[PDB]
Amino acid sequence: NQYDNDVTVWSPQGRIHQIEYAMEAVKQGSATVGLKSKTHAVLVALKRAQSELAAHQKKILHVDNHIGISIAGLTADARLLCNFMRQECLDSRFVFDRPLPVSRLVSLIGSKTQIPTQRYGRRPYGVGLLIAGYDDMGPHIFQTCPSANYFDCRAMSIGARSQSARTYLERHMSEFMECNLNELVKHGLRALRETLPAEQDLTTKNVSIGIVGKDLEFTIYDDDDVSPFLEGLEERPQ
Amino acid sequence: SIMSYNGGAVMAMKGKNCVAIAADRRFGIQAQMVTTDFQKIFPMGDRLYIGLAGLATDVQTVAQRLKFRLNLYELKEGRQIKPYTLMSMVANLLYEKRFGPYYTEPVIAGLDPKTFKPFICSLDLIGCPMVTDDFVVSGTCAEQMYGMCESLWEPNMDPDHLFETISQAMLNAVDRDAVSGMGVIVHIIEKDKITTRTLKARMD
Amino acid sequence: SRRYDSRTTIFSPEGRLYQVEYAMEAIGHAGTCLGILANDGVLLAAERRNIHKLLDEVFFSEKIYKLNEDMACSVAGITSDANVLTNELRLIAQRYLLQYQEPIPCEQLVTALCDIKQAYTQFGGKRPFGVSLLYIGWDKHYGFQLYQSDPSGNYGGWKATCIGNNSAAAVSMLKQDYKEGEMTLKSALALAIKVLNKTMDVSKLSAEKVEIATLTRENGKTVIRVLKQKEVEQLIKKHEEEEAKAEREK
Amino acid sequence: YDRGVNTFSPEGRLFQVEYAIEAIKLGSTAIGIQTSEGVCLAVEKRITSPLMEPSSIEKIVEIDAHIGCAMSGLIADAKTLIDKARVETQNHWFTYNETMTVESVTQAVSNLALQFGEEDSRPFGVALLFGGVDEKGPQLFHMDPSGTFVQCDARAIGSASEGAQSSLQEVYHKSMTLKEAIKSSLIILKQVMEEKLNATNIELATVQPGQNFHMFTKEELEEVIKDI
Amino acid sequence: TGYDLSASTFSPDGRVFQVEYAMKAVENSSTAIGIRCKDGVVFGVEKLVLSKLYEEGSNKRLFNVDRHVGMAVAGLLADARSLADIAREEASNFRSNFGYNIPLKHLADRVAMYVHAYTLYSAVRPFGCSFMLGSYSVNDGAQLYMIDPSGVSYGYWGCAIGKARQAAKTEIEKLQMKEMTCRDIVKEVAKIIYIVHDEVKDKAFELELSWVGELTNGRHEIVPKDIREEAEKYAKESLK
Amino acid sequence: SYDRAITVFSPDGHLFQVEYAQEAVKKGSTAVGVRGRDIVVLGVEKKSVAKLQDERTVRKICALDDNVCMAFAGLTADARIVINRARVECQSHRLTVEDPVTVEYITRYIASLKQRYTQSNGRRPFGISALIVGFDFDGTPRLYQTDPSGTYHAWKANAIGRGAKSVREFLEKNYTDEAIETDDLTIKLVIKALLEVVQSGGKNIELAVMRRDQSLKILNPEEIEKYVAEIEKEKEENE
Amino acid sequence: SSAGFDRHITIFSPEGRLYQVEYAFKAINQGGLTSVAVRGKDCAVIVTQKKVPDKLLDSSTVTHLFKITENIGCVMTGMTADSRSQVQRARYEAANWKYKYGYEIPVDMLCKRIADISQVYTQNAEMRPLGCCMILIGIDEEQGPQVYKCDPAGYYCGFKATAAGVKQTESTSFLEKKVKKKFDWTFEQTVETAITCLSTVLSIDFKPSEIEVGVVTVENPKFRILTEAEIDAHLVALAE
Amino acid sequence: ERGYSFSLTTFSPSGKLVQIEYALAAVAGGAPSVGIKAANGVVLATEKKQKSILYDERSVHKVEPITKHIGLVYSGMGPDYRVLVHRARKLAQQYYLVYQEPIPTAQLVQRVASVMQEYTQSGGVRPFGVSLLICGWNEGRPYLFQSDPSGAYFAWKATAMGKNYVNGKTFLEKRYNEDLELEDAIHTAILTLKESFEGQMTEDNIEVGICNEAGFRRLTPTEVKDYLAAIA
C-alpha cells in the first residue's frame, strides 16, 4: 500500500496506481455515446439532475464550428481543458486562416496531459472526453483517457454502466455507414436506453444531442428540439 | 562645464615631518554665491584628512559613502586605516560608477598611523591614483595653483614656513580665479597636534 | 519531499511553541553575562569559557563587541550563530548614519534586530537564532540603557539583569543588594565582583576567568573602556579585603 | 497517507474537496427562491451576544445594483470571493458598456476556486447563492467548493439544509408570486431554527425587474412577521 | 524493497529498483521486432485489436521522426508519444545549426541522455518505454539501434521488444541477414510474428510493417503490402 | 490525528492549526473596552513589574494614527509586526487619498493581511487578537475586534485574554441600555469591569481614554486611584 | 546504526559515516567488468575486456575506450548509462580549457574538474551520485605519461598501475608483486604485464577478440586504439 | 527543479544540534596533523601514507598555499577539502582587488568560517566534515588559527587534529614552552607526529610546510629527508 501514494512511484508489479485510479473517476459520470456515418457524426449524452427542481447539468458543449466535445468525469478538469481547447482552435484561425485538422488537435492534448502524469505536484486530469470533428477527410470520433492515450474509433460509449451500450454498438456497426440522420441519431439513442435502470424512460429534459455535418455546423439541441428526434420510437421489451 | 558649476580649490603640500591641506569657503551657483561656510575638508580618522572639489552634490555624497565604508572597516579590524589603503578604497568607489560618474576629484593628505611618514595623493573623476612628493592640487583654478607651487616649494620645511608657503599659494591663485574665494581655511597637522587656521582674504 | 522536513512552525494542541521553547533552554547551559546601571555609567561582565593554557586571546575582546561607536553587546548561546547577528547589527546602525547623519538612538536598533530574529520563527522553514544578548549605550533622549534580547524577539529595558539557568540565583541576589538611586561606578564594580564570586564556582576569582567592560559619557566623547587585566587584580583584592570586615561581627 | 493533500481515491473524488463540503454544514442556514416576479432571499444571523453588534454580521452583500448574494460556512474565505466578484463585473462594464449577466458572473467566480495547489493553496469552505435579474428575467444560481455550478429554482444551504429542502419542494410551484414566496420562506425558517423569530434573527433580500433598487428590507420586515 | 521509493536512492547492495521496476513494464507490451538487411532496415510490430471499435490504423507504434528516421515503440503508448516529440525536436535543431541530416549514431546519443535525466531526480520517474531506431544513408549504410528505459543505447543486427523478447530472437539469428535484400526480408518478418502467439490466448491482431532503405531512396514509409497482400499469404502457409 | 498543516481539512471540516492559534490568545493579559456617548475608553490589567526593569518598553496600548487606538493580546513578538505594518497603511492611505483614515478601513487591512498569511504553507499565522477603538469617522464612536482566523467584527463592549468569559458575562448584566453619560460614569464602568481581575490588586490597571477630539490621555495612578475610591463608596450601601 | 534518514539520503550517521556514497562504490560491481591501466615507461597502456553475449549484438558499438581529446583517452567501468553521461562532461570541459585559456588541458587538471562535479551530488541532496568510475591517460610535456582515477565520492589520485571493476583486490595484489623490482619497462614489458595480470586474475587465456587496448606514447602522442591484427601480434608474442 | 528549500537541522529537546556533533566524529577519524606557533614562524605537519606502494606522491598535496604568506591544512575527509580551498582562493583575491594589499590572516578566517556557517543553516545541504588549521606571518607576529565544521574558530599556540588527538594534546603541553626557534619547532612537530605514525617514517610519509616572515613555503622531500636524517 506504500506504493499507492504518488504518480512518480513505480510498483514492484510495474503499474502506477494513481493513473489506474483516475480511470475510476470516469466511471462516476453518466454515459454518453458517439458514432458517425460517412457524412455525419453525432454524439449523444445523458443529463443528470442534482435535485428535483434544479436545472440539469449540461454535458455537450460547443468548441468550434466544426468541433464539439462531450464530457464525463471531473468538472474541474472539464473547463480547464476546454479553455486550452478553445485557445488552440482560434490560433490556427488567426495565424494559418484555416480550421484545425481534428487528428492533430488531439495530439496536443496527449502532450498536455503527459506532464501532470509524470512530474510531481499535479494530479492527472480526471476526464473522459469524446471528440467529434471535421477535417478535410470526413468525420471522426475520438476518445481520450486520463492515461493520456487517445483512440480513433467509429463508435464509443464511456461512463456509468456503458458496457451495455457497447454491446448494442458492436452488433449494429455494419449499419452505421449508410443510414442518414433521421435514424442515425436514433440508432445512437437506442444505445443509451440500456444504460438506464429498466423502470424509467429517456425523457425530453435529460438528454442532449449534438450534430456536426459535412455541410452542417456543429449544433446543440436540448429540451425543446429533442421532440422531433424522440418521435417514432418503440418501447423497451418489458 | 559641470565642474565649473560651483567652483572650488583644494591644495595639499608635504613638509618635513608634517603635512598641510587647504581649501576655499565659497558656496554658490554659477555666478551667484549662497554662503561662505561650505565644508570641503572632512576628517577620516586622526592625522588623516580628505579634501573634495567639483560638483557640490557629489562632494556631500561621496563623503558620506566613504564614511559608510570606513566605519565598517574599522570595526572588523581593531586597527585604523593606512593612507595607502584609503586611496585604494576611494578608487574602488569611483570606478563602480564608470559610466555614471561622480563629478569630484578627491585629495587625500595625512600621516602614517605608526611612523611619522606623510602621504599625499589625488585622483581623477574615475579613479586614477597619483602619488607625489611635493604637492597635489584640484579644482577649477588648477593652472594658477601650479604656478605658485612650482616656485615656492622647498624640500625640507618646518611647520612655520610650510604654513606660510601654502598661505601665499592659496591667496594669490584663488584671487586670480573668479568663481572661487570668500575665505580660505588651512589645516596643518603633525605627530603631536592639529592646527586649524583661517586666513584674511578678499571677500569680493 | 515531505517525510524529510522538520516542523519549526507548528503550534501545540494547547497553543505553546515546540521549537522556540527548546532554543530558550540551550542559552541557560552557556556562559554568564550581566549589566548594571549607574548614575554616570554602565558596565558589562562576562564569564570565560575554554580557559585552557594553549590559547592566545589576541582579539582584546571576545564576549564584548563594540558595535557602533557608543554601544556594545555581550553574547550568549551558539557562538557559530552569533557572528551572523553582529555583522548585520553593525550594518543596520551604519545605514542609519548614511540616511540621517545622526547616530542610532539605541532602541530602534534593537527592534531592527528583533524583527530579523523573529522572522525565522515565522515564514520559511529555517532554524531560529539560539542567541540572547545584552545591550549598553547612550542617546540624546534617555541616556544610559540596558536591553535584553530573546530568541522569540522580545526585548525589555532592565536596570540590572543577567542570564538564567547558568546564573539564575544572581537575579535573586540583584533584588537584594542593588539599591535604587545611587548606583555609581565604584559601588557598581564592587557589586559585580561580589555576584560572580558565587555564580562562578571557581574559588578566589582568578582574573583570567572574567572580563569587564564599561562606558562613561566623558566630555562629549562616550568612551568604551575595556579595562585591562592588571586592574582586575586590585578590584578582586578589594572584595577579598571585605571578608576581613565580614568576620568581625562573629 | 490516508488521502492527504492532492491524491486520488481508489474509488472516487478527492477527499480534500469532499471534506470541503462538510465545512458548509457548520455554517448558517439560508434560503433563496426564484419567482417570475423576482428573487426573494433569507438567512439566519446567529447572533450570540447582545453586546455583539447585530448589523456587523453580513450574509447578503451587494455584488452589483442588480445582483444579490448569500453565503454560508467560512466567513474568512468568503470575503475573497465577494471581492473579485465585484471587480470583474465592473471590468465588464468598463469594456462593454453593459451589465454582466447573472450566469456569467459565476463563470468567473468558479474559475478561481478550481486553482488550489502549488500551480500558478487549499480549497475553499463556502457555498454561495446568487440572485439577480438579467435580460432573461430573474435568475438564481448556486456554487460549491468543488466548482460544480448549476441553476436552481429554490435552494436552501447551510446547517440543517437537508431538512429544509424536504419541505421546500412541497410548497413550491411554478406560478408563485413574490408577496407569496416571502412568507412561504420564513415559515420554513422558524421550523428549522430554535429561537423565536423576530426582527433581529433574520433578514431579507429582494430584487425585481422594475425595482432594481432595494436589495435589503429594513424594519418593514417587522410588518411581515406579525402578518404570519 | 522499501528504499525502493525514490529514483535518487541506492539499495544496500547497489542498484536502483525504480529503474528495475520500469523495465518489466515494457515486458507486458506486445512484441515489436526489428531487423536490417544489407541495404535497408525493416520494422515489424505485432499489434492487437482492443475490442472491435478500433478503426483500423489508430494509435500506431510505427512513428516517423525524421525524413529517414522512425521509431518502433513498445510499452506505455502515451509516454512514447512525448518521447517521440523530443526526437522530432532534436533533429530539427541539428538541421538549423548544421545544414544536413542527423546521423543516427548522434541522434541515439541525444535521446538516451534525455532518458537518462529522468532516472536521477526524486521529482520525476524513469520512462516506461523501449523503442527502435532505423535509418539508411549512402555514406553510412543502414543502422539499427536499441534504447532501454535506463538509457543504454547501442547497435544490433536484429532485436525484439515485448513479451517474446527471447522467444523471437531465437529464430531471428537463424537467418542469413548479411546478404538478403529487404524485399525478401518483408516476407520473412511476417512469419516471425505469426509463429509466437498472434491470437492464441489473445483475441485478434493486425500486422504493421515499416520500411526504409535503398529502394525508398532514403525515405521512410509503411510497406505497400496492402498491395498484393504477400506477407500474410506467405506466413500463413507455415501452419505445418 | 490529522492536523500538522494549515491546508488540510478534518473529516468533519475543521482547520485545527487555525483553531490552535486562538488557544495562544488565552495566555495573554485581559484588556477590555467600551464605547460611550463621546468618550471611548479601554483598559488593560496584569502589569506585574519585576523590581529591576524600566516599564516604558512593555506598553500594550499604542496609537496607529492620530485618532485611532490599539489594544492586543497573544504573544508580544507577532504584535510588533502587525502594529508597525498598520502604521504604514494608515499613513499611506492618507497620501493616496487625502482624507483621514476611518476606523473601519484599518481593521479590514489587518484582517486581510492576516487572511492571506493563513493560506500558504510554511507561514505560521499570527497568534494575536486585537481591539481597534476609534471615534474618528466623523464624530462617531466605534470599536471593532479581530481574530487569528482573520475575521474583523464589531462589538459594543469587549473582553479578551485569560478570563474573557467571566468579564463578557459580567458586562451583559451590567451594560445598561441607558447610555452611560457623564463620562466618568463610563470610566467607572470599566474600573468596575476590571475589578474582576485575575488577582484585583487595584494598582495593576492601566486605563486609557479618548475624548474623541484630543489625543490619547494616559491616566495616572492618582486619578485612577480616585476612581477606585468612589467604587468603594458605592459599595458601602450593601450593609 | 540507522538514525533519522542516514540509510536513504546523504546525511551523516553516528560515527561520522555516510552510506549513500559507499553504496555507490559497489555500484560499479554490477558491470561484470575489470579494467587495467599500467604506466611503466615513456608510454601508457589501457586494457579492458568486452563481453559480447549475442550474435545479433554488434562489435564496433561495444567499446568502452573513449577518446576525450586527441591526447587524452579514458576507460569507463560501472553501469553504462552513468558512464556515457560522465564522458559528455569530460568532452565538454576539455574544450572550455582550450577556449578560455588558449592551450591544451593537462590530464591532471581535467581529473580535478570531473571530481568536483561528483562533489556537489554528494553535497546536495535529491541528486543521484553517478555510480561509475573513470580512468585517464595522457602525455604531459616535461612530466612524462600519467594515469589518473576518479571516484564517485569526488576523490582522485594518480598512480602507476591501476585496477578497477570487480577484481581490484586480486589485481592490485598482483601488481605490487610485479612492481617491486622496477625492471626495464620497454613498451612490450608494459603490454605483457597488462595482459598477464588480467589473464591470471580472470584466468581465461583468451581469444584475440575479446579485449581492447588503448595506448599513448611519447613518440606519437595521439590516442590510439589497437587493431585486432596487432592485438593478436602481442598475444602470440607472450606464448612462451 | 522543485525548489524544496528546507534545512536538515533542528534543535533537540535537550537543546543540542545533532548533525553538527555527528560531523565532528568524521573529523576525529581523519588523518592526524599538528601545528606549532614558534617565536619567529609557524610550523605545519601532517600524516600522508598511501594505502599501496603504487600511489604517486607528487600528485596530491596536503600543505596548500592560499596566498604567498598563508597556508592551510586539514584533518577529515578528502574531497570536501578542495571545495573550501578554491573558495578561499577566490575570496582572498577579492580583498586584494578592493584594497590593493594582501589579506591578514585574521580577516581571512572571519570569512571562511562564514562560508562553513552557511552550509549548516541553509536548505537540504549537509555541514562540512573537515576542520582546518590556518597559518601566516602578517605584520611581524605570526598567527595560527583553527576552524571547525560548526562555524566557530579559535587561536592556538600548539594543537593537534585527527586521530589520537588527546594524546598529542598532552604531549604538546608537556613539550612546548613560551618560545622556540622555527628549526626547533619542526623537531617537536615530528616527534608529536611520530607518536601516532606507523612503523616507518620517510620523506614521503610526512609532509611539512613552514611560515617564515619571508613568506609561505612548503618543503620538498630533500629537506624533509635531511631533517629526519638521525635528528630524531
Curated annotation (Swiss-Prot), chain A:
Its GO biological process terms?
immune system process; negative regulation of inflammatory response to antigenic stimulus; proteasome-mediated ubiquitin-dependent protein catabolic process
- UniProt KW keywords: Acetylation, Cytoplasm, Glycoprotein, Immunity, Isopeptide bond, Nucleus, Phosphoprotein, Proteasome, Ubl conjugation
Keyword NAD appears in the UniProt entry? no
| Source organism, top-level taxon | Eukaryota
Tell me the Pfam families matching this sequence: Proteasome (PF00227), Proteasome_A_N (PF10584)
Q: Which GO terms describe its cellular component?
A: centrosome; cytoplasm; cytosol; extracellular exosome; nucleoplasm; nucleus; proteasome complex; proteasome core complex
Cross-referenced InterPro entries: Ntn_hydrolases_N, Proteasome_alpha, Proteasome_alpha-type, Proteasome_alpha1, Proteasome_asu_N, Proteasome_sua/b
Covalent crosslink: Glycyl lysine isopeptide (Lys-Gly) (interchain with G-Cter in ubiquitin) = 112, 205
Spell out the protein name for this chain: Proteasome subunit alpha type-1
Instruction: List the source organism.
Output: Homo sapiens
- Assembly and interaction partners: The 26S proteasome consists of a 20S proteasome core and two 19S regulatory subunits. The 20S proteasome core is a barrel-shaped complex made of 28 subunits that are arranged in four stacked rings. The two outer rings are each formed by seven alpha subunits, and the two inner rings are formed by seven beta subunits. The proteolytic activity is exerted by three beta-subunits PSMB5, PSMB6 and PSMB7. Interacts with NOTCH3. Interacts with ZFAND1.
- Subcellular localization(s) per the UniProt record: Cytoplasm; Nucleus
Q: Which residues carry this modification: Phosphoserine?
A: 107, 174
Family that this chain belongs to = Belongs to the peptidase T1A family.
Glycosylated residues, per the record, are 107
**What does the induction field say?**
Induced in breast cancer tissue (at protein level). Up-regulated in liver tumor tissues.
Q: Name one GO molecular function term.
A: lipopolysaccharide binding
From Swiss-Prot, chain C:
Q: Which GO terms describe its cellular component?
A: cytoplasm; cytosol; extracellular exosome; intracellular membrane-bounded organelle; nucleoplasm; nucleus; P-body; proteasome complex
Q: Where in the cell is it found?
A: Cytoplasm; Nucleus
Task: Tell what triggers its expression.
Answer: Down-regulated by antioxidants BO-653 and probucol.
Q: Has keyword Transcription regulation?
A: no
Top-level taxon in the UniProt lineage: Eukaryota
Q: Which SMART domains does the record associate with it?
A: Proteasome_A_N
- What keywords appear on the UniProt entry? Acetylation, Cytoplasm, Host-virus interaction, Nucleus, Phosphoprotein, Proteasome
- Sites bearing Phosphoserine, chain numbering: 12, 74, 172
**N6-acetyllysine modification, residue list:** 126, 175
Against SUPFAM superfamilies, the record matches this protein to:
N-terminal nucleophile aminohydrolases (Ntn hydrolases) (SSF56235)
Q: Which InterPro entries match?
A: Ntn_hydrolases_N, Proteasome_alpha, Proteasome_alpha-type, Proteasome_asu_N, Proteasome_bsu_CS, Proteasome_sua/b
Pfam families listed in its UniProt record: Proteasome (PF00227), Proteasome_A_N (PF10584)
Got any disulfides in this one, which pairs? none
Grouped into one coarse class, the protein's main location is: cytoplasm
Keyword set includes Nucleotidyltransferase: no
Alphabetical GO biological process terms: proteasome-mediated ubiquitin-dependent protein catabolic process
- Subunit record text: The 26S proteasome consists of a 20S proteasome core and two 19S regulatory subunits. The 20S proteasome core is a barrel-shaped complex made of 28 subunits that are arranged in four stacked rings. The two outer rings are each formed by seven alpha subunits, and the two inner rings are formed by seven beta subunits. The proteolytic activity is exerted by three beta-subunits PSMB5, PSMB6 and PSMB7. (Microbial infection) Interaction with HTLV-1 TAX protein favors NFKB1 activation.
The UniProt similarity line reads: Belongs to the peptidase T1A family.
Name this protein carries in UniProt: Proteasome subunit alpha type-4
Organism in which the protein naturally occurs: Homo sapiens (Human)
Curated annotation (Swiss-Prot), chain F:
Q: Please name the gene that encodes this protein.
A: PSMA7
Spell out the protein name for this chain.
Proteasome subunit alpha type-7
Listed A to Z, the keywords are:
Acetylation, Cytoplasm, Glycoprotein, Host-virus interaction, Nucleus, Phosphoprotein, Proteasome
For this protein, the record's PANTHER family field holds: PROTEASOME SUBUNIT ALPHA/BETA (PTHR11599)
Glycosylated residues are 129
- PTM field: Phosphorylation by ABL1 or ABL2 leads to an inhibition of proteasomal activity and cell cycle transition blocks.
Localisation: Cytoplasm; Nucleus
- In the record, N6-acetyllysine modifications are located at 226
UniProt-reported outcome of changing residue 152 to F: Displays impaired G1/S transition and S/G2 progression
For this chain, the family text in UniProt reads:
Belongs to the peptidase T1A family.
Question: GO terms for CC?
Answer: cytoplasm; cytosol; extracellular exosome; nucleoplasm; nucleus; proteasome complex; proteasome core complex; proteasome core complex, alpha-subunit complex
Q: What CDD domains does this protein map onto?
A: proteasome_alpha_type_7
| Keyword Signal listed | no
Q: Which InterPro entries match?
A: Ntn_hydrolases_N, Proteasome_alpha, Proteasome_alpha-type, Proteasome_asu_N, Proteasome_sua/b
Explain what induces or represses this protein's expression.
Down-regulated by the ribozyme Rz3'X. Up-regulated in colorectal cancer tissues.
- Report the GO molecular function annotations: identical protein binding
Respond yes or no to whether keyword Nucleus is given for this record. Answer: yes
From which domain of life does this come? Eukaryota
From Swiss-Prot, chain H:
Q: What is the lineage of its organism?
A: Eukaryota, Metazoa, Chordata, Craniata, Vertebrata
The record, for CDD domains, names: proteasome_alpha_type_2
What does the entry say induces or represses the expression of this protein?
Down-regulated by antioxidants BO-653 and probucol. Down-regulated in response to enterovirus 71 (EV71) infection (at protein level).
Q: Which residues carry this modification: Phosphotyrosine?
A: 4, 22, 74, 119
- Locate the N6-acetyllysine modifications and list their residues: 68, 169
PTM (free text)? Phosphorylated on tyrosine residues; which may be important for nuclear import.
**What gene does the UniProt entry assign to this protein?**
PSMA2
Instruction: Kindly provide the name given to this protein in its UniProt entry.
Output: Proteasome subunit alpha type-2
> In the UniProt record, which is one GO cellular component term?
proteasome complex
- Is Acyltransferase one of the keywords UniProt gives this record? no
This protein's assembly is summarised as:
The 26S proteasome consists of a 20S proteasome core and two 19S regulatory subunits. The 20S proteasome core is a barrel-shaped complex made of 28 subunits that are arranged in four stacked rings. The two outer rings are each formed by seven alpha subunits, and the two inner rings are formed by seven beta subunits. The proteolytic activity is exerted by three beta-subunits PSMB5, PSMB6 and PSMB7.
What Pfam families would the database entry show? Answer: Proteasome (PF00227), Proteasome_A_N (PF10584)
The alphabetized UniProt keywords are:
Acetylation, Cytoplasm, Nucleus, Phosphoprotein, Proteasome
